[PDB]
Design a protein around this ligand. Structure first.
Ligand code: HEM
Ligand SMILES: Cc1ccc(C(=O)O)cc1
Length: 393
């Protein structure tokens, strides 16, 4: 009853052009079986959304990657937030929700904005830049590590540890195997940085440790919660900002509308989050026999959710392959959905908005003038290099 496919969603030429294979996954049926890895797959918006909003049946405690934590040892101590179910997930979530609260964005908005404008002034003096190295990577690095309260020496390990975490969600391919057999410089650094003494006062990390008196988390849980924001924050936001600049480079009509109304900068970033989906996939593990899309899935089965394919479903979106900065982007699963929906979505949208804002007010044209290279990862979609010349406004 369930269609079996030989498509490998974690192969290099799937990453090169995933959109043709993603409709084959959508059009094969509401639920497919991927024989390459012995997992169930869901690529339509309706099934992806349903799985994310049923955490008791499609849990996260047994791993949000391919590995079943009930069968294999995790490559690192499990996350107290991402790889946890309610109720153990509830209050560690409530902490990170308050550390990255609306009231917290009020304190960093000016610095995040001024550092975006300063960066968009710095490359305009250069003209021909790399939008990945000098914009998509440079700006979040110039702002988020300071917002965490991190020291200066050792920050070269943050992006490599970011790519390792998302590569380790994938199957035991060479991308995952090679990422792990590097690690422990990145591991030991990220580990060492989560200790309370190395967290500058006022930063996100020092605020997480202060949230141990509250009885929501204990002092031994605080280092892992700091590790989460050091594992999934930089790269997907870097990939997200690199997505929007790419789209404004591909769709000059949308760049012109953003210039005419810089208020659209926040939704322009959100549509780019849906259009590229930096976090492409995430697994869930069935806690019981479940029926979804006429399919009977047994206990302990891995269910792969195609977040990017669900963001391009024509059953849910109108002309989903075109970037529209005015689209009603509400409902996209780029940030997840349900109890696990991204806890730092406010930090990501803040970074993306003020960066597109500075582009909206100071940039006239964004023209590709060099070979565009792609960065391959088991879970992350993003560009390695985006050679661009920025025309000043
Ligand atoms: C473009 C930017 C971002 C994207 C696309 C993104 C994507 C996602 C997705 C899809 C999830 C759900 C994972 C799941 O359900 O298994 C998630 C959760 C999470 N995100 Fe983000 N994220 C972004 C930015 C950030 C930032 C800036 C932070 C922190 C400063 C952050 C921290 C987290 C954490 C800790 C979780 C786990 C929350 C939970 O499991 O309840 N993310 N993110
Ligand atoms: C996307 C993502 C990656 C890692 C984590 C974590 O808890 O470390 C949370 C979310």
């Amino acid at each position: 009853t369930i269609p079996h496919l030989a498509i490998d969603p974690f192969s290099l030429d799937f990453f090169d052009d995933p959109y043709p294979d993603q409709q084959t996954l959508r059009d094969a049926g509401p639920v497919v079986y991927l024989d390459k890895w012995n997992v169930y797959g869901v690529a339509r918006y309706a099934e992806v959304h349903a799985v994310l909003n049923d955490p008791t049946t499609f849990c996260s405690s047994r791993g949000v990657g391919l590995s079943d934590f009930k069968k294999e040892k995790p490559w690192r101590p499990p996350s107290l937030i991402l790889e946890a179910d309610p109720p153990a997930h509830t209050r560690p979530r409530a902490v990170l929700s308050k550390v990255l609260s609306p009231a917290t964005m009020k304190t960093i908005r000016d610095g995040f904005a001024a550092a975006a404008d300063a960066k968009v002034d710095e490359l305009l003096q250069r003209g021909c830049i790399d939008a990945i190295a000098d914009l998509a990577e440079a700006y979040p690095l110039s702002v988020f590590p300071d917002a965490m309260g991190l020291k200066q020496e050792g920050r070269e390990h943050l992006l490599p540890y970011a790519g390792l975490v998302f590569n380790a969600f994938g199957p035991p391919n060479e991308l995952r195997q090679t990422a792990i057999e590097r690690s422990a410089p990145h591991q030991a650094y990220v580990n060492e940085q989560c200790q309370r003494p190395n967290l500058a006062p006022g930063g996100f990390g020092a605020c997480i440790h202060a949230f141990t008196d509250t009885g929501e988390i204990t002092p031994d849980e605080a280092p892992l919660l700091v590790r989460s924001l050091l594992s999934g924050a930089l790269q997907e936001t870097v990939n997200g900002i690199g997505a929007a600049v790419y789209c404004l480079a591909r769709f000059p009509g949308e760049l012109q509308r953003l210039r005419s109304d810089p208020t659209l900068a926040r939704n322009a970033f959100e549509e780019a989050v849906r259009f590229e989906s930096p976090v492409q996939t995430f697994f869930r593990t069935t806690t019981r026999e479940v029926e979804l899309g006429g399919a009977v899935i047994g206990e302990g089965e891995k269910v792969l959710m195609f977040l990017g394919s669900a963001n391009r479903d024509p059953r849910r979106w109108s002309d989903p392959d075109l970037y529209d900065i005015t689209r009603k982007t509400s409902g996209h699963v780029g940030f997840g959905s349900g109890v696990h929906m991204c806890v730092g979505q406010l930090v990501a949208r803040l970074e993306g908005e003020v960066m597109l804002s500075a582009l909206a007010r100071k940039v006239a044209a964004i023209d590709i003038d060099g070979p565009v290279k792609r960065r391959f990862n088991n879970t992350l979609r993003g560009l390695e290099s985006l050679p661009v010349k920025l025309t000043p406004a």
